[PDB]
């Protein structure tokens, strides 16, 4: 029949349009599959960056721990030096005052020795004059 | 003719069902393309975040490097101070002994001069008596 | 006859298109699984960046404490050094004053011995003139 042949031909056409659509979707899918492989490789490149940064942070963490310890060692050394310098300031104050006292005492002894030298002359001259 | 007509309608229905299913698959693919765009935008935000993290790690590294150098300089300055304080301990210990010796010697000279002073008085009184 | 054959060809073509549709459906399901895994990897990456920044901030605070300690130690060594320089100078002046005292006391020692001998010489002489 005429109506039957016409519908059959419309179905042939519609099956062709559905196959065009299937071909288009297959290409969209293939391209997406390929693009996800590149995204996975972009993730790998970022993973590589993070491994290098983490390695640098761990190296810095070790350096900070060494420096915390070195600072503690320097602190023990300056802790120890300071009282030794305080003690030298005390000993030098002590010696300065004792040196000034010696210089006064030697000066007094020098003048007293000159007075006794003069006295021996005075008295010997006097006694000699009486003889 | 009858069987043909019935199968032609089954084909009309099956072609329409295939089209509806193809349209549903197209919408699933559009959703995946949207998921891909979001993933790419997350990766781009991570790249941008890495500019700040790299900058911060480098700033930290440089601060640690400066501190390592400061510790080295301070250690050299304490290494230089220590033997100077050891030297001053020696210098002041030897000066202390020389100051104590001078104090004993000046004390002895003072008492020896007092002995001679009285000897002069005694001998002059004696000689005066004989004249 | 021709119509009957074309209708069965359409049945065959619809069945082939349905195999392809079912295959594409499964390929889309697989791609959806790949996307879910990528989203999980992004979540892990996001936290790996948060973990690095957390560690860098913590380390920065430890470094700040060490920079502070270094400044403190630097203030202490800056203060100690001029005190040691001063002790070198003061002890050098005290040494010169001690050497001068030793020469002066030595001289007064010899002079006092000479005056002791002079008193003996002169008393013997005066006794000789009287007796
Ligand atoms: Cl290391
Ligand atoms: Cl972050
Ligand atoms: Cl950071
Ligand atoms: Cl006489």
Report the alpha-carbon distance of residue C52 to residue C19 in Å, rounded: 50
Return the number of other C-beta atoms located less than 10 Å from residue C72's C-beta: 12
Q: What are the CA-CA distances from residue A48 to residues A34, B49, C43 (Å)?
A: 22, 15, 16
List, as one string, the DSSP characters of C53-108.
HHHHHHHHHHHHHHHHHHHHHHHHHHHHHHHHHHHHHHHHHHHHHHHHHHHHHHHH
Q: Which two tokens stand for residue A43?
A: 């993730």
Return the number of other C-beta atoms located less than 10 Å from residue C37's C-beta: 11
Q: Kindly give the residue spans of alpha helices, DSSP state H, lying in B1-131.
A: 2-130
Resolution of this model in Å is 1.4
Buried b (16+ CB within 10 A) or exposed e, A93-112: eebeebbeebeebbeebeeb
- The Å distance, Cα C50 to ligand 2 centre, comes to 4
Spatial contact of A77 and B82, defined as CB atoms under 8 Å apart: yes
Report the alpha-carbon distance of residue C55 to residue A61 in Å, rounded: 9
- The Å distance, Cα A126 to ligand 4 centre, comes to 12
For residue C76, give the nearest of A36, A78, A99 by CB distance: A78
For residue A105, give the nearest of B8, B43, B106 by CB distance: B106
Report the alpha-carbon distance of residue B92 to residue A85 in Å, rounded: 12
Q: Is C114 exposed, middle or buried (0-12, 13-18, 19+ CB in 10 A)?
A: exposed
Q: Which two tokens stand for residue C11?
A: 């049945």
Interface of B with C in 63-122 (CB under 8 A): 63-64, 67, 70-71, 74, 77-78, 81, 84-85, 88, 91-92, 95, 98-99, 102, 105-106, 109, 112-113, 116, 119-120
Q: Which of A35, B42, B65 is nearest to C49 (CA)?
A: B42
Return the number of other C-beta atoms located less than 10 Å from residue B105's C-beta: 18
Method used to determine the 3D structure? X-ray
- Which helix (H) or strand (E) segment holds residue C125: the answer is helix C2-130
Whole-angstrom distance between the N-terminal and C-terminal Cα of chain B? Answer: 192
Q: What are the CA-CA distances from residue B86 to residues B83, B91, C15, C50 (Å)?
A: 5, 9, 103, 53
Taken in order C97, C99, C104, C109, the sign of the CA dihedral is positive
Spatial contact of C79 and A84, defined as CB atoms under 8 Å apart: no
Return the number of other C-beta atoms located less than 10 Å from residue C50's C-beta: 12
Q: Which of C97, A128, A111 is nearest to B95 (CA)?
A: C97
For residue C21, give the nearest of A22, A78, A120 by CB distance: A22
CA angle C71, C77, C80 (to 5 degrees): 145
Maximal CA-CA distance, chain A: 192
What's the domain count of chain B?
1
Report the alpha-carbon distance of residue C123 to residue C115 in Å, rounded: 12
- Which helix (H) or strand (E) segment holds residue A92: the answer is helix A2-130
Structural domain of B47: 1-131
- The Å distance, Cα C1 to ligand 2 centre, comes to 74
Report the alpha-carbon distance of residue B93 to residue B109 in Å, rounded: 25
Residue B123 C-alpha from the chain's centroid: 84
Residue C59: how many CA atoms within 13 Å on its side-chain side?
27
Residue B98 C-alpha from the chain's centroid: 48
Q: Which two tokens stand for residue C3?
A: 């119509």
């Amino acid at each position: 029949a005429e109506e039957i042949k016409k519908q059959v031909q419309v179905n042939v056409d519609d099956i062709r349009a559905a196959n065009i659509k299937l071909d288009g979707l297959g290409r969209q899918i293939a391209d997406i599959s390929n693009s996800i492989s590149t995204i996975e490789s972009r993730l790998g490149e970022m993973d590589n960056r993070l491994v290098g940064i983490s390695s640098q942070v761990t190296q810095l963490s070790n350096s900070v721990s060494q420096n915390t310890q070195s600072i503690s060692s320097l602190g023990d050394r300056i802790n120890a030096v300071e009282p030794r310098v305080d003690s030298l300031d005390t000993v030098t104050s002590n010696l300065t005052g004792r040196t000034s006292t010696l210089e006064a005492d030697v000066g007094s002894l020098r003048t007293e020795l000159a007075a006794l030298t003069t006295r021996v002359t005075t008295e010997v001259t006097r006694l000699d004059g009486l003889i």
